[PDB]
């Protein structure tokens, strides 16, 4: 039933261990990417943007899924340091252009007839 | 569109990373939402060098699932245009290579010739390229009167046009030193890297789809493929040039004994009824009506059947859901297998000659990126 | 059957090495290239004098569309809707509601040129040869909006490229 | 029967965060599983 | 009835060249060097 | 078109235009269909 | 006259801007065939003063040819910015100008004009070689319909 | 409202937003951004253009196909304005010359056209007008800028009773004509700053803030009549301003004062050129006077927008002016400036 | 051919690959769940996820198979089955001019040990499947995005990612770069519900449920 | 046959007419509206009505294969003279 | 079916007919399957369709000109296997391969007929009947089908207020909700009431009930009247058709009191039609005699 094959994790411990130095690699990644890619957003801005993206993937409770997020997570940092990505790619997570989607009931009610 | 990112140990290169994807259109994804007839021009847009040959692969593939064979006449036209694409492709292949090196004149003599067969495509289908001529069941329209004579006149003069392409490149010591002893691929590495077509032919390996598993009507025709000794970019260049000479005879053999008969299979459930038949026969209207709304329903199954496209082993792997629409058609391309070994291919050589390796690899960003 | 290409076994005799040494020392294959190119120079070119003359085409040529009409002027289109049922790029949009004389013919026939593929499936799909691929191709415009065709634009081109299209379809209906 | 550092998770399988769908397209959606109703004409 | 589809002539189309026709134009290696040296001696004289 | 002209019909254009792009007689795209729904017209009664 | 001198100078300034403009490519897809298949002897363009040349710093008009994927979108924008002024872009092919076949797919922007300010649109899938040659001719005629020095003098 | 004008769509490019703008003279610094902030949610912008079409090329991308309809117009041709604002729900006036030209003196550019377009638009039954004027519109200022700015302001306010006059302080941005001006002194003698610039503690506004402010003014129902006053987030003095920008741009800073009438000759020399006058004796007075504080007029934050800081979103233009020396240098390297923030 | 409409069928090829299917079945019956010949004379091998390396190595070096030409590797993602991703290889043998299809099954989470040891051709036939579908192959040299935009999310060729995707590009003046945004279509891709309500083939009829 | 709108916009056969308040009419200003003057609605009002005589007429559309899929039209409703749906050509019986 | 015809003779042609502004008759397409006749005289209960003549030129028509009156006439469209009988309003408006079908219900009648809504380009073209047996079964009454154009008639699409003179002028939401809010917080109890309409959603009914109660008021009236006295709405069986029309066939004698179901609940009568035809129901109604 619950028998599934691993890729990198058995227990949440080592699963949370992988996201630890994944943060560590990403934590030290911010100071170089902002300067080398010539942005405008601040260093701590990037650091918290890395931070928050962790919190989005926090409600999952399966060692089986987190590592899939880890490999997806580790599938991006090298794309930044080795100048593979571009300014439109790494500032994209800095969601800037789009207008702010209304959150309260009235403002959604006013904008359109959609949920 | 090529994003080659690669390392310079001084002037010497140790690993080349060809970041393909710059032209990636998810062709198979759109194919999932079109009928077989609608999905056909996608293959026509896959290898926009030897376009009609891509129709050949898709056609016999759908013929194989449908258990319907093309009429004998239509079989012979397809190989005529199939080899014209071979003439189309190798002319582009040798010259773009020569264009990459720095040879300009071979590019324009051969590209002067390219108009003649593009003009032939105009007379037979109605477009310079992307003919959409070869369809499941044979070919859409019949050959216009006098076209066979016209291609005969072009073919009877084309062997002359090859000579200069050979004369000032094959003998030119400049072309040799800029094309020999580069992109050398050993036989087993070529085979096990998934390479197809000329890389197999160039590296000494005796193998060709058109002869080992002769599809269509290639049975009756007779010729000889040019397997060489070394397999470097120069050797493949002779294989390319000799293939145009070989394609000339293949054109000759189908030309002189073109059989009489229909252009499309006499199966209205798979081939649209004739326009004259459309406006007189009640079944013709019904069959034509539904064929252009949903099309023929293909029985379930899956095939990969491939043809010897001038790029190499080109095949399509479609799965049928038992309806009038494909489920998934993996676009197997020689170029993706061709380029898969680029890391080794540029190994041991510098920039100015691995660009020659790019030329001999016959990479075109419609087969890989789709 | 197959034939080799590279292998040559160049003979190492005194006469043969002289030719190879002469070829290297006093270049001969290179001067061959000069001779071939010069022979190319003394040959009249193949260039065409556009627009004063334009290259050949075929009766089957597929170009800018046009909605044709009967001998008396009736729209051939009946909104059977086969054309967009086979339009590979879904460039055709059609709506039909009643026409004054009891009829319920079409109102909307917009083939987006920037979506169309010019495959010619529409003209083959049409059972009344209403939509056709015209011979014209010189309709380049500087606005994206111009290429977005409508019903009136299609009908006007049908009245513009009419005699030519009628002759082509008369010279091609036996093939189709 | 088989074991290679076997993983045993009781949590209901959920890709969600890995399939890449956006939040408003995972929370504010409605999916009605049913059998297609045949067209009464046919 | 009658059928007038495109067809080859009532025999066959004329035979078409299929091999390489690279010609051999020039003098022997001895002749090339001899005329070159002969000019040099002429020029020196 | 000499020798034998093509066929003659009423609806063929009396003269062939040129490419009208970039000129005041350009082509403009517009919706050829009719407005599907119509609003509820409010009566202008004096009131109440 | 004051208007006459600026009229003669304006013509001289742009008389050969429509005859010495040199095309630039990116050559994405099957439209990249007619890109230089026109450079082939048949539909000679070198005679028209135009001649293909990449040299993004030293070219006049770029003929955007092929399908514009999102992945390449930075590359075109950086090329057009590096493009010197005056600059024009020509959208060859249905895919380039309006997406064409793949308009509904996920990895192509629907038309090039969504990315670059797009001049004369030449349609075709692909545009048969002379159709762009006609399109290039329209671009040169558009160059004549310019009042650069006239507008400056009016201000 | 009109059936076609009702807004639909999830605020997208093809979403009918109802706004039908007619931004006048949008081929300018603010026009590009406001059009972008107009075409982003699908507003049918009918921009009148008077220059070469090529100069309007950069405006086509910021909008769905067929949304940005370019039309020609003339200041002296009344029919030109009447056409452009004919089928216009809203009118946005932005025309203004920052220098003096022969065909248009400074009187008309803020009296003739702004009054004429406001009058005809009311005569054409438009529903709004957002004509803008500098916060320092001052008929008492000897500079012909601020005189004509408020001289004609009464006409547009009167002829259009509900005219939402806009009063921005200092619109700094990419092509702001001030930040780029201050670096141009590198080839005009080392920083000739009058009185070492001790006169202009100022609050400049970023373009996104003001341009966003405009698009709210169209959709904000209260915008009618009430004149808003767009301000910065932070008061900064010239010697503080120029030192800061010369520090972020890393250009050598050598401020140097001189008599005011010397700049009158400097202004005169730059205006004499038969082309774009690099320096006008008008604007030096404008930069000389500080940010006049008008507290009665509602500010930027009233509409519902926070004013982005100067030091934050400024590197964009300063980076362009850096030489190869410290071009790649980042933003936090530089020291922020002395915030007086009155 | 007395029936030129139909495709003529061959039986000497039919039984021979049928016999070879048994041959491979006996040699290693640990992984082959079942073998299916085709009317198209394309015999197919159905293997287990752990069986990828054994069979692929077996057909590579065996003296009676010699299948060493990797044709393609792809997925046939089928939502209705618990193993949605159906990984299938195609092999070609020059010596005996035959084509072998080996088919596996996998969930979104289960991995497959990389076949780069068998064929280095898979090196790039592995990357796109991880990108296009999302299934991850273990012990592979690199799992990079090869056929998508940089930073692209999800997996397109799945039966979950819509045709138009979720994100659209456009060049914006304020940022001076081509930025992204949620997709918006001028035209919605219309639906063509074209599957007939009449049964097509009695032969391939699904067994009653 | 074409009728002119109050604003001068020539209406098409479908009946489309941009009113005064339709803001999108600005697309038409400084340009020209494209109307096919030949109005296919009224090109059959004047077309002669065939007096071919039989209970059923084979209407092929003229030009043989260049017309429309030929249909059989029944002439038994003397009130309504038969019209080919494809063609619109008008056929009547010689008073039965 | 074949792929061609050996037919080289002529085809018979028959004139059209006019039996309704909804059904459209192209009777040359008729295949004489007699489905309409058996439907008319067994399901709709009207004995007017028939096949006049014999041989091969016979027509499935009505001989004497007729005006098809049955309220189940719309289902005659969905039973004919050819285009011989077709819906006039939907004719030449859409084709099947583009109409996205959504399964929904009917609100015209108090049966909640399971229907298929054809949608294309933000609008509905034609309404089809679904299947659930107890509900509409395989047929729907006419006004259930030919009602899509009603959604294209007078439509309330914007908020409304009385302007300075009163005249109904279109306004934003803010003024509309502000106007109601001012008079909503004021007044209490029986001052604030509610009258339920015909086509009111259960979601809205709850919302009004909660809203009226949160301002301490219970006056949520309804259009039709049902005596509250005795038990009223308290007992569920008072206001329910507890017999589950799918069970009417099981019954033997039907007693209909003060109703005209052929005009009020056509499908409920259609069940009796089917049930009484096969199960031999004994019907008895007091009131005005209507067919
Ligand atoms: C009016 C204009 C008239 C002149 C036009 C240009 C003439 C020169 C170029 C073309 C000459 C003919 C080329 C030709 O025959 O090529 C094939 C021939 C034969 O080529 P081949 O390679 O077949 O020669 C075979 C014989 N062996 C192997 C021994 C070489 O080319 C030659 O003979 C080239 C000889 C070049 C000699 C160069 C060195 C001396 C230069 C002296 C100063 C000048
Ligand atoms: N700190 C500041 O400087 C502030 C300035 N403002 C106001 O902003 C306005 C300018 O903004 P912006 O548009 O970005 O400035 P730009 O100088 O960048 O552009 C000015 C525009 O005005 C047009 N124009 C000028 N004169 C005429 C004329 N006679 N006929 C037609 N068009 C004309 C120009 O046309 P063309 O491009 O062909 O020259 C151009 O489109 C001025 O009114 C200014 O006072 C508001 C707040 C603060
Ligand atoms: S053009 Fe032809 S196929 Fe298309 S709707 Fe009109 S009649 Fe039907
Ligand atoms: S030619 Fe164009 S309009 Fe016609 S079917 Fe092909 S893509 Fe559609
Ligand atoms: S327009 Fe046609 S030829 Fe050009 S890139 Fe698109 S599909 Fe290819
Ligand atoms: S249901 Fe239709 S086809 Fe059948 S008899 Fe009646 S009219 Fe004829
Ligand atoms: S769709 Fe059916 S009913 Fe209509 S004409 Fe064709 S075959 Fe006859
Ligand atoms: K029917
Ligand atoms: Zn007819």
> With helix as H, strand as E and coil as C, how does H140-192 read?
CCCCHHHHHHHHCHHHHHHHCCCCCCECCCCEECCCCCCHHHHHHHHHCCCCC
Contacts of K260 (CB under 8 A, 6+ apart): K287, K288, K290
Q: Touching check for G81 and chain A: CB below 8 Å?
A: no
Closest CA to H238 of H202, H292, H192: H202
Task: Give dist(CA I172, CA G116) in Å, integer.
Answer: 10
Given a contact cutoff of 8 angstroms between Cβ atoms, the answer to whether B70 and B366 are in contact is no
Q: Please report the DSSP string for chain C in residue order.
A: -B--SS------SHHHHHHHHHHHHTT-HHHHHHHHHHHHHTS------TTTS-----TT---SEEE-B-TTS-BS-----HHHHH-TT--EEEEE---TTS---EEEEEEBTTT-----HHHHH-TT--EEE-S-----BSSHHHHB--HHHHHHHHHHS-HHHHHHHHTTTTT-
Distances in Å between the alpha carbon of E43 and those of C27, E27, E39? 21, 22, 6
Task: Give dist(CA H163, CA H156) in Å, integer.
Answer: 7
Residue appearing with tokens 């096969």: K278
DSSP-based three-state secondary structure for J72: strand
Closest CA to C132 of C105, C96, C84, C169: C169
DSSP-based three-state secondary structure for I46: strand
Ion ligand 9, residue ranges at CB < 5 A: J 59, 61, 84, 86-87
Task: Give dist(CA E28, CA I41) in Å, integer.
Answer: 61
Given a contact cutoff of 8 angstroms between Cβ atoms, the answer to whether D11 and A62 are in contact is yes
Q: Is I12 exposed, middle or buried (0-12, 13-18, 19+ CB in 10 A)?
A: exposed
Distances in Å between the alpha carbon of B362 and those of B100, B355, H193, H256, J31? 12, 11, 64, 66, 49
Closest CA to H283 of H254, H263, H256: H263
Residue appearing with tokens 């619950």: A2
Residue appearing with tokens 């996998």: I106
Given a contact cutoff of 8 angstroms between Cβ atoms, the answer to whether K134 and K245 are in contact is yes
Distances in Å between the alpha carbon of I78 and those of B321, I14, I31, I159? 11, 28, 22, 8
Task: Give dist(CA E42, CA H96) in Å, integer.
Answer: 85
Report the residue of chain F nearest C139, measured CA to CA. F19
DSSP-based three-state secondary structure for B6: strand
Q: Please report the DSSP string for K129-162 in residue order.
A: E---SSSSTT---HHHHTTGGGGGSSB--S-EEE
Task: Give dist(CA K190, CA K218) in Å, integer.
Answer: 7
Residue appearing with tokens 């909605």: C67
Cis link prior to G86 (omega < 30° from 0)?
A: yes
When CB atoms are compared, the residue of H52, H61, H104 closest to G148 is H52
- Other Cβ atoms closer than 10 A to I185: 14
Closest CA to H56 of H78, H35, H87, H82: H35
Q: Touching check for K95 and chain C: CB below 8 Å?
A: yes
How far away, in angstroms, is K25 Cα from ligand 8 center?
A: 10
Distances in Å between the alpha carbon of B239 and those of B185, B203, B225, B245, C1? 15, 10, 8, 10, 14
Tell me the two tokens of residue G99: 């997406």
Cβ(K35) to ligand 6 under 6 A? Answer: yes
List CB contacts (< 8 A) between C122 and chain G.
Answer: none
**Residue C162 annotated as binding?**
no
Given a contact cutoff of 8 angstroms between Cβ atoms, the answer to whether B33 and I163 are in contact is yes
- Other Cβ atoms closer than 10 A to C56: 10
Tell me the two tokens of residue B146: 């006098």
Tell me the two tokens of residue H87: 């089928």
Distances in Å between the alpha carbon of B233 and those of B14, B102, B202, B205, B335? 19, 15, 8, 15, 15
Given a contact cutoff of 8 angstroms between Cβ atoms, the answer to whether K157 and K125 are in contact is no
Task: Give dist(CA K259, CA I42) in Å, integer.
Answer: 70
Given a contact cutoff of 8 angstroms between Cβ atoms, the answer to whether H94 and H215 are in contact is no
Task: Give dist(CA C137, CA B343) in Å, integer.
Answer: 44
Cis link prior to K166 (omega < 30° from 0)?
A: no
DSSP letter at J10? B
Given a contact cutoff of 8 angstroms between Cβ atoms, the answer to whether B80 and B255 are in contact is yes
Given a contact cutoff of 8 angstroms between Cβ atoms, the answer to whether K23 and K49 are in contact is no
Task: Give dist(CA I4, CA B71) in Å, integer.
Answer: 7
Task: Give dist(CA I154, CA I183) in Å, integer.
Answer: 15
Taking every pair of Cα atoms in chain D, the longest distance, rounded to a whole number of angstroms, is 58
Closest CA to H34 of H14, H5, H63, H11: H63
Task: Give dist(CA B200, CA B207) in Å, integer.
Answer: 7
Task: Give dist(CA C162, CA F6) in Å, integer.
Answer: 10
Cβ(C155) to ligand 3 under 6 A? Answer: no
Closest CA to H40 of I176, G103, I171, G81: I171
Q: Touching check for H3 and chain F: CB below 8 Å?
A: yes
Resolution (in Å) of the shown entry? 3.7
- Other Cβ atoms closer than 10 A to B38: 24
Task: Give dist(CA B169, CA B99) in Å, integer.
Answer: 12
Task: Give dist(CA B129, CA B108) in Å, integer.
Answer: 19
Task: Give dist(CA H68, CA H62) in Å, integer.
Answer: 8
Closest CA to A67 of G100, D5, H170, H126: D5
Classify each residue of B183-200 as buried b or exposed e, where b means 16 or more C-beta atoms within 10 Å of its C-beta: bbbeeebbbbbbbbbbbb
Task: Give dist(CA B320, CA B65) in Å, integer.
Answer: 8
Residue appearing with tokens 């007008």: H129
How far away, in angstroms, is I131 Cα from ligand 7 center?
A: 47
Distances in Å between the alpha carbon of C20 and those of C29, C153, G50? 10, 70, 44
Tell me the two tokens of residue H188: 């005009």
Distances in Å between the alpha carbon of A82 and those of G126, H74, I100? 37, 53, 40
Given a contact cutoff of 8 angstroms between Cβ atoms, the answer to whether C118 and B129 are in contact is no
Task: Give dist(CA H284, CA K118) in Å, integer.
Answer: 69
When CB atoms are compared, the residue of I153, I182, I197 closest to D20 is I153
Q: Is I190 exposed, middle or buried (0-12, 13-18, 19+ CB in 10 A)?
A: middle
Tell me the two tokens of residue G19: 């005859």
Which of C70, C74, C80, C125, when mutated, tests ligand 3's pocket best, judged by the most ligand atoms within 8 Å of its CB?
Answer: C80
CA angle C91, C93, C98 (to 5 degrees): 160
Tell me the two tokens of residue E20: 């390489």
Task: Give dist(CA B30, CA B34) in Å, integer.
Answer: 7
Contacts of G92 (CB under 8 A, 6+ apart): G31, G34, G35, G63, G64, G65, G122, G124, G126, G127, G132, G135
- The torsion angles phi and psi of K267, rounded to 5 degrees, stand at -70, -35
What is the 3 state secondary structure string of A13-70? HHHHHHHHHHHHHHHHHHHHHHHHCCCCCCHHHHHHHHHHHHHHCCCCCCHHHHHHHH
B47: number of CA atoms within 13 Å, CB side?
34
**Residue C121 annotated as binding?**
yes
Instruction: For residue K253, give the H/E element and its range.
Output: strand K253-257
Given a contact cutoff of 8 angstroms between Cβ atoms, the answer to whether I165 and I156 are in contact is yes
DSSP letter at K245? G
**Which own/partner pairs from K42-45 qualify as long-range (CB within 8 Å, at least 24 positions apart)?**
K42/K273, K42/K277, K43/K72, K43/K75, K43/K139, K43/K270, K43/K273, K43/K274, K44/K70, K44/K71, K44/K72, K44/K73, K44/K75, K44/K76, K44/K273, K45/K70, K45/K273
Residue length, chain I? 209
Q: Touching check for C16 and chain I: CB below 8 Å?
A: no
- Other Cβ atoms closer than 10 A to C175: 17
Distances in Å between the alpha carbon of H285 and those of B295, H150, H183, I174? 77, 16, 19, 30
The answer, yes or no, to whether E and K have at least 3 beta-carbon pairs within 8 Å is no
Given a contact cutoff of 8 angstroms between Cβ atoms, the answer to whether H294 and H167 are in contact is yes
In angstroms, the first-to-last Cα distance of chain J is 34
Tell me the two tokens of residue B68: 């319907």
CA angle B275, B276, B282 (to 5 degrees): 90
Distances in Å between the alpha carbon of B216 and those of B83, C171, K250? 12, 31, 67
Torsion (CA) H26, H28, H34, H37 in degrees, nearest 10: 110
**Which own/partner pairs from C21-27 qualify as long-range (CB within 8 Å, at least 24 positions apart)?**
C21/E29, C22/E29, C22/E32, C22/E33, C23/E29, C24/B173, C25/E33, C26/E32, C26/E33, C26/E36
Instruction: For residue B17, give the H/E element and its range.
Output: strand B12-19
Contacts of K4 (CB under 8 A, 6+ apart): B268, B273, B277, B281, B283, B284
Strand-pair partners of C148: C112
Query: Are the Cβ atoms of G27 and B1 closer than 8 angstroms?
Result: yes
**Residue H173 annotated as binding?**
no
Tell me the two tokens of residue K272: 């009796």
Task: Give dist(CA I156, CA G107) in Å, integer.
Answer: 10
DSSP letter at F39? B
Q: Is H143 exposed, middle or buried (0-12, 13-18, 19+ CB in 10 A)?
A: buried
Q: What is the CA radius of gyration of chain I?
A: 22
Task: Give dist(CA G136, CA G34) in Å, integer.
Answer: 13
Tell me the two tokens of residue H100: 């003096």
Q: What is the helix, strand, coil percentage profile of chain G, to 5? A: 45, 10, 45
Task: Give dist(CA H153, CA H173) in Å, integer.
Answer: 25
Task: Give dist(CA H236, CA H238) in Å, integer.
Answer: 7
Given a contact cutoff of 8 angstroms between Cβ atoms, the answer to whether B215 and I99 are in contact is no
DSSP-based three-state secondary structure for B217: coil
**Residue C126 annotated as binding?**
yes
Dump strand ranges (E) for chain J: 56-59, 71-74
Tell me the two tokens of residue B295: 């099309």
Query: Are the Cβ atoms of B111 and G41 closer than 8 angstroms?
Result: yes
Residue appearing with tokens 């059998």: D35
Strand-pair partners of H110: none
Given a contact cutoff of 8 angstroms between Cβ atoms, the answer to whether H133 and H168 are in contact is no
Classify each residue of C130-161 as buried b or exposed e, where b means 16 or more C-beta atoms within 10 Å of its C-beta: bbbbbbbbbbbbbbbbbbbbbbbbbbbbbbbb
Query: Are the Cβ atoms of A97 and H40 closer than 8 angstroms?
Result: yes
What experimental approach yielded this model? cryo-EM
Tell me the two tokens of residue K231: 């038990």
- The torsion angles phi and psi of I208, rounded to 5 degrees, stand at -60, 145
């Amino acid at each position: 039933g619950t028998s599934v094959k691993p890729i990198f994790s058995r227990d949440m411990n080592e699963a949370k261990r992988r996201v630890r130095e994944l943060y560590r690699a990403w934590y030290r990644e911010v100071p170089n990417t902002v300067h080398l890619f010539q942005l405008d957003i601040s260093v701590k801005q990037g650091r918290d943007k890395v931070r928050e993206m962790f919190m989005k993937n926090a409600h999952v409770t399966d060692p089986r899924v987190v590592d899939l997020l880890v490999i997806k997570g580790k599938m991006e940092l090298e794309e930044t340091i080795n100048v593979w990505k571009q300014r439109t790619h790494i500032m994209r997570f800095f969601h800037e252009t789009e207008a702010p989607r209304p959150t309260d009931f009235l403002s959604k009610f006013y904008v359109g007839h959609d949920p | 569109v090529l994003r080659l990112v690669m390392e310079l140990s001084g002037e010497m290169v140790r690993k080349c990373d060809p970041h393909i994807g710059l032209l990636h259109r998810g062709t198979e994804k759109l194919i999932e939402y079109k009928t077989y007839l609608q999905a056909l021009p996608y293959f026509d847009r896959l290898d926009y060098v030897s376009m009609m040959c891509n129709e050949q692969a898709y056609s016999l593939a759908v013929e194989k699932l449908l258990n319907i064979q093309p009429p004998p006449r239509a079989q012979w036209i397809r190989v005529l245009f199939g080899e014209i694409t071979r003439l189309l492709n190798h002319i582009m292949a040798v010259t773009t290579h020569a264009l990459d090196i720095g040879a300009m004149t071979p590019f324009f003599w051969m590209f002067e010739e390219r108009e003649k067969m593009f003009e032939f495509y105009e007379r037979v289908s109605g477009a310079r390229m992307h003919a959409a001529y070869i369809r499941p069941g044979g070919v859409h329209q019949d050959l216009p009167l006098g076209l066979l004579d016209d291609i005969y006149e072009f073919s009877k003069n084309f062997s002359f046009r090859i000579d200069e392409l050979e004369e000032m490149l094959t003998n030119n010591r400049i072309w040799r030193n800029r094309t020999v002893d580069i992109g050398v691929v050993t036989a087993e590495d070529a085979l096990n890297y998934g390479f197809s077509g000329v890389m197999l032919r160039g590296s000494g390996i005796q193998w060709d789809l058109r002869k080992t598993q002769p599809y269509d009507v290639y049975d009756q025709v007779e010729f000889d493929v040019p397997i060489g000794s070394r397999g470097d970019c120069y050797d493949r260049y002779l294989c390319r040039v000799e293939e145009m000479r070989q394609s000339l005879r293949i054109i000759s053999q189908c030309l002189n004994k073109m059989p009489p008969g229909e252009i499309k299979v006499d199966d209205a459930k798979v081939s649209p009824p004739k326009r004259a038949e459309m406006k007189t026969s009640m079944e013709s209207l019904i069959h034509h009506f539904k064929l252009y709304t949903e099309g023929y329903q293909v029985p379930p199954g899956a095939t990969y059947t491939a043809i010897e496209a001038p790029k190499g082993e080109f095949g399509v792997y479609l799965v049928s859901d038992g309806s009038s629409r494909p489920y998934r058609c993996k676009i197997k391309a020689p170029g993706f297998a061709h380029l898969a070994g680029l890391d080794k291919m540029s190994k041991g050589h510098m920039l100015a000659d691995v660009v020659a390796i790019i030329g001999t690899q016959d990479i075109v960003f419609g087969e890989v990126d789709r | 059957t197959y034939k080799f290409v590279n292998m040559r076994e160049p003979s190492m005799d005194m006469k043969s090495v002289t030719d190879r040494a002469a070829q290297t020392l006093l270049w001969t294959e290179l001067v061959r290239g000069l001779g071939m190119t010069l022979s190319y120079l003394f040959r009249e070119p193949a260039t065409i004098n556009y627009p004063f003359e334009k290259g050949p085409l075929s009766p089957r040529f597929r170009g800018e569309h046009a909605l044709r009409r009967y001998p008396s002027g009736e729209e051939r289109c009946i909104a059977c809707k086969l054309c967009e049922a086979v339009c590979p790029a879904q460039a055709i949009t059609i709506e039909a509601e009643p026409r004054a004389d009891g009829s319920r013919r079409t109102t909307r026939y917009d083939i987006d040129m920037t979506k169309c593929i010019y495959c010619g499936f529409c003209q083959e799909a049409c059972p009344v040869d209403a939509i056709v691929e015209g011979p014209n191709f010189e309709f380049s415009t500087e606005t994206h909006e111009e290429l977005l065709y409508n019903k009136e634009k299609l009908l006007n081109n049908g009245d513009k490229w009419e005699a030519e299209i009628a002759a082509n379809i008369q010279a091609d209906y036996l093939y189709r | 029967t088989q074991d290679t550092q076997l993983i045993a998770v009781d949590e209901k399988l959920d890709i969600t965060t890995l399939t890449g769908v956006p939040e408003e397209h995972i929370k504010t959606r409605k999916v009605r599983i049913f059998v297609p109703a045949r067209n009464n004409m046919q | 009835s009658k059928v007038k589809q495109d067809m080859p002539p009532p025999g066959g189309y004329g035979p078409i060249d299929y091999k390489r026709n690279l010609p051999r134009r020039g003098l022997s290696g001895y002749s090339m060097f001899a005329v070159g040296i002969g000019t040099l001696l002429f020029g020196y004289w | 078109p000499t020798t034998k002209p093509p066929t003659a019909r009423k609806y063929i254009w009396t003269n062939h235009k040129f490419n009208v792009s970039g000129t005041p007689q350009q082509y403009v795209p517009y919706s050829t269909t009719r407005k599907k729904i119509q609003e509820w017209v409010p009566p202008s009664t004096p009131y109440k | 006259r004051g208007e006459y001198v600026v009229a003669k100078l304006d013509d001289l300034v742009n008389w050969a801007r429509r005859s010495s403009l040199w095309p630039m490519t990116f050559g994405l897809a099957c439209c990249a065939v007619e890109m230089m298949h026109m450079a082939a002897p048949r539909y000679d363009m070198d005679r028209f003063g135009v001649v293909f040349r990449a040299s993004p710093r030293q070219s006049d008009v770029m003929i955007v040819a092929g399908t514009l994927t999102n992945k390449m979108a930075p590359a075109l924008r950086k090329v057009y910015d590096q493009m010197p002024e005056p600059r024009y872009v020509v959208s060859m092919g249905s895919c380039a100008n309006g997406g064409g076949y793949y308009h509904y797919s996920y990895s192509v922007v629907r038309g090039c004009d969504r990315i670059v300010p797009v001049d004369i649109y030449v349609p075709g899938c692909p545009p048969t070689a002379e159709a762009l040659l006609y399109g290039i001719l329209q671009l040169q005629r558009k160059i004549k319909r310019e009042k650069r020095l006239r507008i400056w003098y009016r201000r | 409202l009109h059936h076609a004008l009702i807004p639909h769509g999830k605020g997208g490019r093809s979403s009918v937003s109802g706004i039908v703008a007619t931004v006048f003279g949008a081929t300018g610094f603010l026009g590009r951004y406001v059009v972008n902030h107009l075409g982003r949610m699908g507003s049918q912008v009918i921009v009148p253009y008077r220059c070469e079409p090529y100069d309007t090329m950069h405006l086509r991308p910021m909008g769905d196909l067929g949304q940005i309809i370019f039309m020609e117009w003339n200041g002296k041709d009344k029919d030109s304005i009447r056409k452009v604002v004919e089928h216009s729900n809203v009118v946005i006036n932005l025309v203004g010359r920052e220098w003096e030209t022969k065909n248009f003196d400074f009187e008309d550019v803020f009296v003739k056209i702004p009054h004429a377009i406001a009058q005809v638009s009311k005569e054409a039954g438009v529903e709004k007008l957002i004509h803008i004027s500098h916060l320092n519109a001052d008929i008492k200022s000897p500079s012909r800028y601020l005189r004509s700015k408020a001289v004609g302001e009464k006409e547009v306010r009167a002829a259009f009773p509900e005219a939402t006059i806009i009063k921005p302080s200092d619109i700094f941005g990419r092509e702001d004509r001030f930040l780029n001006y201050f670096a141009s002194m590198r080839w005009f003698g080392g920083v000739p700053l009058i009185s070492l610039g001790k006169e202009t503690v100022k609050q400049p506004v970023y373009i996104v803030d003001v341009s966003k402010g405009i698009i709210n003014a169209i959709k904000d129902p209260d915008a009618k009549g009430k004149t808003f006053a767009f301000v910065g987030p932070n008061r900064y003095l010239l010697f503080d301003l120029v030192q800061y920008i010369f520090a972020v741009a890393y250009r050598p800073f050598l401020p140097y004062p001189l008599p005011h009438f010397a700049y009158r000759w400097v202004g005169r020399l730059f205006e004499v050129s038969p082309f774009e006058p690099w320096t006008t004796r008008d604007k030096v007075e404008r930069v000389h006077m500080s940010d006049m504080t008008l507290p009665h007029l509602p500010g930027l934050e009233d509409l519902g927008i926070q004013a982005t800081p100067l030091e934050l979103k400024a590197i964009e233009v300063l980076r362009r002016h850096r030489t190869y020396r410290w071009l790649t240098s980042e933003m936090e390297d530089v020291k922020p400036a002395k915030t007086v923030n009155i | 051919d007395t029936r030129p409409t139909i495709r003529p069928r061959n039986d000497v090829v039919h039984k021979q690959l049928s016999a070879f299917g048994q041959y491979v079945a006996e040699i290693l019956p640990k992984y082959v769940q079942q073998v299916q010949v085709s009317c198209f004379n394309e015999l197919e091998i159905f293997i287990h996820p752990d069986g990828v390396i054994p069979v692929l190595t077996f057909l590579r070096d065996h003296t009676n198979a010699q299948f060493k030409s990797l044709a393609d590797l792809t997925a046939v993602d089928v939502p209705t089955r618990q193993n949605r991703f159906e990984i299938v290889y195609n092999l070609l043998s020059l010596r005996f001019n035959s084509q072998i299809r080996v088919k596996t099954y996998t969930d979104e989470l289960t991995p497959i040990e990389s076949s780069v040891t068998v064929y280095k051709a898979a090196n790039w036939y592995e990357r796109e499947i991880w990108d296009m579908f999302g299934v991850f192959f273990a012990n592979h040299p690199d799992l990079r995005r090869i056929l998508t935009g940089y930073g692209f999310e999800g997996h397109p060729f799945r039966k979950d990612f819509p045709l138009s995707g979720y994100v659209e590009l456009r060049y914006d003046d304020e940022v001076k770069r081509v930025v992204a945004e949620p997709v918006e279509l001028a035209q919605e891709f219309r639906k063509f519900d074209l599957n007939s309500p009449w049964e097509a083939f009695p032969a391939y009829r699904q067994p009653p449920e | 046959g074409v009728r002119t709108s109050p604003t001068g916009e020539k209406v098409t056969h479908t009946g489309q007419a941009y009113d005064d308040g339709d803001y999108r009419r600005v697309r038409f200003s400084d340009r020209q509206k494209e109307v096919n003057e030949n109005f296919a609605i009224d090109l059959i009002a004047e077309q002669p009505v065939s007096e071919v005589g039989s209970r059923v007429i084979s209407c092929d559309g003229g030009g043989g294969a260049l017309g429309h899929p030929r249909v059989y039209i029944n002439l038994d409703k003397e009130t309504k003279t038969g019209t080919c749906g494809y063609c619109g050509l008008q056929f009547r019986q010689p008073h039965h | 079916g074949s792929d061609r015809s050996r037919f080289l003779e002529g085809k018979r042609a028959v004139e059209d007919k006019n039996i309704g502004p909804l059904v459209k008759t192209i009777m040359t397409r008729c295949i004489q399957c007699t489905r309409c006749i058996r439907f008319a005289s067994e399901i709709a209960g009207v004995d007017d369709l028939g096949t006049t003549g014999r041989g091969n030129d016979m027509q499935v028509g009505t001989y004497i000109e007729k005006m098809f009156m049955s309220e189940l006439s719309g289902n005659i469209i969905d039973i004919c296997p050819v285009g011989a009988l077709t819906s006039k309003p939907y004719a030449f408006t859409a084709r099947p391969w583009e109409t996205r079908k959504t399964e929904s219900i009917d609100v015209m009648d108090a049966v909640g007929s399971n229907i298929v809504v054809s949608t294309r380009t933000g609008e509905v073209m034609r309404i089809l009947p679904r299947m659930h047996e107890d509900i509409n079964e395989e047929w729907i009454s006419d006004k259930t089908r030919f009602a899509y154009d009603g959604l294209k008639r007078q439509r309330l699409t914007q908020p409304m207020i009385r302007n300075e003179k009163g005249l109904l002028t279109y306004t934003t939401w803010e003024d509309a909700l502000s106007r109601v809010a001012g008079m909503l917080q004021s007044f209490q109890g029986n001052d604030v009431a509610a009258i339920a309409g015909g086509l009111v959603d259960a979601e809205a009914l709850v919302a009004l009930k909660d809203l009226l109660n949160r301002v301490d008021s219970d006056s949520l009236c309804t259009e039709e009247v049902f005596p509250t006295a005795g038990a009223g709405t308290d007992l569920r069986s008072n206001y329910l058709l507890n017999t589950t029309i799918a069970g009417v066939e099981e019954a033997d004698v039907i007693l209909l009191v003060g109703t005209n179901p052929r005009f009020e609940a056509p499908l409920f009568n259609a069940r009796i039609r089917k049930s009484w035809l096969h199960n031999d129901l004994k019907v008895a109604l007091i009131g005005s005699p209507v067919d």
